[PDB]
Amino acid sequence: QTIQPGTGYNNGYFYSYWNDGHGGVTYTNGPGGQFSVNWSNSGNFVGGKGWQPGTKNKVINFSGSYNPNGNSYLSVYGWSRNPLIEYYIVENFGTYNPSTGATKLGEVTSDGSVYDIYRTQRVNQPSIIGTATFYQYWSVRRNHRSSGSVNTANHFNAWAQQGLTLGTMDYQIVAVEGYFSSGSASITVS
Ligand code: NA
Ligand code: NA
Structure with a gap:
C-alpha cells in the first residue's frame, strides 16, 4: 500500500522510505519485492525494497520502469557500521550525476558496463545512527539500464582494492532517490 x-x-x-519533509512524494509497496513511487516537485527522498541486513556477496535482481524528470537515482543502496558507510551502485539516473560531488578512485567493469568509483565525505549529516560524519562510496554505471x-x-x-573499507552491513535495498525533481518509477527486486 501507499505508506x-x-x-x-x-x-x-x-x-x-525516507524524505526530508518536503511533500509531493507517494511511495507504495506492492506484492513480493515490488514498489512504486510517484513524485511531483519533491525535495530529497529515498525509497525501496531489499534486505535487512544485506550481505557482501548478494546478487541482486531488479526490473521495471524508471522515468525521472530531473535529479534522481536508481541504485543498489545501503549502509554498513564500523565503519559507518553509505553506499550506492547506481544503475540509472536522471539529469544529475553523482560524479560532481564526489572524488574518483578508479573503475570496475561489472555486469556489462564500466562503472566509475568515487568516495565523498558527508560531514555532520543525517544517517542511520543520527547526525554523523561518514564516507559515501559510489559505483556509477556508465550505461544506464532499467x-x-x-x-x-x-x-x-x-572498492576494497582502492582502499575503501566496508563495515558490517545494515540494510541493502534497490532504491529510487529523488532530489528536487519529479518522476515516476515501478520496480521489482529479488
Ligand atoms: Na537515465
Ligand atoms: Na549537515
Whole structure:
C-alpha cells in the first residue's frame, strides 16, 4: 500500500522510505519485492525494497520502469557500521550525476558496463545512527539500464582494492532517490 516514511517488512522484503519533509512524494509497496513511487516537485527522498541486513556477496535482481524528470537515482543502496558507510551502485539516473560531488578512485567493469568509483565525505549529516560524519562510496554505471542483475561483490571488492573499507552491513535495498525533481518509477527486486 501507499505508506508514510519509515522502515519495516512487506511481503518478505525489508523496505525503507525516507524524505526530508518536503511533500509531493507517494511511495507504495506492492506484492513480493515490488514498489512504486510517484513524485511531483519533491525535495530529497529515498525509497525501496531489499534486505535487512544485506550481505557482501548478494546478487541482486531488479526490473521495471524508471522515468525521472530531473535529479534522481536508481541504485543498489545501503549502509554498513564500523565503519559507518553509505553506499550506492547506481544503475540509472536522471539529469544529475553523482560524479560532481564526489572524488574518483578508479573503475570496475561489472555486469556489462564500466562503472566509475568515487568516495565523498558527508560531514555532520543525517544517517542511520543520527547526525554523523561518514564516507559515501559510489559505483556509477556508465550505461544506464532499467533491469538486470548486480553482483554486489564486484563493487565491494573493487572498492576494497582502492582502499575503501566496508563495515558490517545494515540494510541493502534497490532504491529510487529523488532530489528536487519529479518522476515516476515501478520496480521489482529479488
Ligand atoms: Na537515465
Ligand atoms: Na549537515
